[PDB]
Amino acid sequence: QVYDYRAKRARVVFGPELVTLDPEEQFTVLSLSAGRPKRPHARRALCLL
């Protein structure tokens, strides 16, 4: 998902479609719990599964 500061509007997308941002649009980066077992901040990624 990405939020547009210019349109003041978020938009979400998934599946086999590449994103193409407007200049004010920004990715919704997401922290993940990774590490060998678990860890509150590790392998941060915007690509939620």
Partner: protein
């Protein structure tokens, strides 16, 4: 008449701009959006966080 200073282009977009001040009356205001050259009296004003 005599030249004083050369105003230059000040590129601007939506959700972007600069603070300025009307020296004739002290009127500070934040111009935004479309590109805007300073008028005859307005001057750059500085924010203080």
């Amino acid at each position: 008449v005599e030249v004083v200073e050369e105003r230059q282009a000040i590129p601007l977009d939506q959700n972007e701009g600069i603070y300025v001040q009307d020296v004739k009356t002290g009127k500070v205001r934040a111009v935004i959006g479309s590109t805007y050259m300073l008028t005859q009296d307005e001057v750059l004003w500085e924010k203080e966080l």
